[model samples]
Target: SVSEIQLMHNLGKHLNSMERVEWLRKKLQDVHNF
Candidate 1:
């Protein structure tokens, strides 16, 4: 939850939160896989 809040702030009024969310999920997949 804190990460989500931080993401928005880091993104700065981004138009695509889910897009970023999916990006994060993909990143997680890579991190967890290896």
Candidate 2:
């Protein structure tokens, strides 16, 4: 049970801490250029 709990805790800690990526300059997709 200890290992299972530790794995869950570790997963939870990192899952919500994901960094967001920002684009300073606007990126154009192929649909937009058309």
Candidate 3:
């Protein structure tokens, strides 16, 4: 496989964690909007 995209789980976990923060931000943003 010359060209492939597969990162390790630890890195992927942090990427997912980053998304989790986005969800929290969305919650707070909505709360403020209300």
Model 2 TM-score on a 0 to 1 scale: 0.24
**Each candidate: RMSD to true structure?**
8.7, 11.7, 9.3
Candidate with more favorable, higher lDDT: 1 or 2: 1
Tell me the RMSD of model 2 versus the true structure.
Answer: 11.7
Per-residue lDDT of model 3, residues 1-34, tens digit only: 3223235322332334545455555565556544
Sort by lDDT, top down from the best:
1, 3, 2
TM-score of 1: 0.30
List, residue by residue over 1-34, the lDDT tens digit for candidate 1: 4344565545433425664565565565556544
Arrange candidates, best TM-score first. 3, 1, 2
Residue-wise lDDT of candidate 2 within 1-34, one digit each (tens)? 2234444334332322121112212223323532
Alpha-carbon local distance difference test for all models: 0.52, 0.29, 0.44
Worst 10 residues of 2 by lDDT: 15-24
Candidate 3 local Cα displacement, residue 12, angstroms: 16
Candidate 1 backbone collisions, by pair: none
